[PDB]
């Protein structure tokens, strides 16, 4: 039982029983915390429990000290002190924040907002707390025991009675039975097995509850400026590619840690491979939470950096397809390309963190635990779309409020900001730059004169939760003939459903907002879907409209972000 108090590091014997991380609280702290919340159960070498036989006391304050053993008011020997008193609760070696963490359902958006407000040690808390609390809740969900299988990815699934049924985007992933992990989407649900395998009919599905591991390291290590460039030595022969990130790679160079918001298209891949191009002999680890964020990342070194010092790091759990033009898992190429999960116990140079908005507390944390660096560079976008919490149903995460770097970007401002979007028509930009940035995104290309709204409301349909909006396609469709040239577009929506009906019909490839991060395409048809609080989030419509490289097509729900887009309007 012995360890540190979690909110003021006072070394104790106790433990809170009632916190499902079971945390170390001081004698001072454990009082503040038992005598404030539902919280009682206190946990030491033997748990603070009434030693007199077959007596069911385990509320701290109801107990007393039997000379060295614990008891009740009904059991307690004539000699006897209240466990609880004077602040303390007695143990060896002798609050509101803490207090609403370890209490809080993760339901509610305040609970996020303290999860990042908090001090750093209540952030790690936090952090733990959530992430064991969204595991348990897959405990919750009914099995799925397959009917029929329809060809090699085509299925029927029938469901556990009683128990409710999970969300069926690819964000959620089904460890089936073993076989491997399996995603699900929609009588007739598309199987995608990650391993390829005859899905016999009765074979069951349960939800991939994984262990939450305890974090050590903080979200953000502390500040440390420097007077000049430390452990890096700069090239002089520069690039003029590079050139216009000269002043920022020494930024990164006289500061123990520095952040970089770049909007869309601003480059920020670009700096990121070409900080290795600024200081050659240095090791650089590039990170990312998500597989195709460490893949584009591994894009742009491909056509800058030397190939055979690249090494692509894949968990050899293998879930989907990744980066193949690398050599696979060499923890030791001086660049390593690997996802947050999968980051080996090694050092570098610089650390590279990109898509930084998609990155959770939890996240900041392992990153800081598995890697130490001389340098570490967190790059992106707090405009962009977060990390879904799964559990969060009441209210709005805002971006300050996504990751302590987040928090940072929002606040005293980024370190360095990248101003000019190369990709996007100027309708595009202009409006992204009001709606997100502060009027200071500038536009490097034209208006493109293919940027197009349609103010259309059509008819909301739901299958489940995700919405389909069918008159918005049609929509579409009658465009398409009248505009042959936007059939190599690419379809976005804020659902599932809406690109699944839209596929059928259309045949265009398509994308969910979510999934369309961090990639760019010519053309952009964009149906709004409905007019919920999901699909007119501003970190999303930013990400949607800037998706498009010559030409867009909006057809719009919401008067409001209709009104605010810069594109010509069109009739019908
Ligand atoms: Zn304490
Ligand atoms: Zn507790
Ligand atoms: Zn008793």
Redesign the pocket.
Known sequence: AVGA?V????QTSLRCGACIRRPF??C??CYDHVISTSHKLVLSVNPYVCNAPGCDVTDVTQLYLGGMSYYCKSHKPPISFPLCANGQVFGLYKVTDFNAIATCDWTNAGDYILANTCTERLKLFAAETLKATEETFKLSYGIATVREVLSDRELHLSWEVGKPRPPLNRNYVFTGYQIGEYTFEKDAVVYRGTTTYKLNVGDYFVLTSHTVMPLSAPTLVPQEHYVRITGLYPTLNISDEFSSNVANYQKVGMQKYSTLQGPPGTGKSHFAIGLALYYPSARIVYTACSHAAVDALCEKALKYLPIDKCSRIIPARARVECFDKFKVNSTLEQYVFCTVNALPETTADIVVFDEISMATNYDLSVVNARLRAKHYVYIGDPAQLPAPRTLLTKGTLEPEYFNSVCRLMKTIGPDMFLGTCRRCPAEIVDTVSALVYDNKLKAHKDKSAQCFKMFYKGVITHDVSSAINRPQIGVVREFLTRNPAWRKAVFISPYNSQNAVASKILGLPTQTVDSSQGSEYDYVIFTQTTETAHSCNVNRFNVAITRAKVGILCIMSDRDLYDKLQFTSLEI
């Not at 909110?7 to 006072?10: A, I, V």
């Open positions: 108090c909110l003021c590091n006072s609280l001081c001072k702290c």
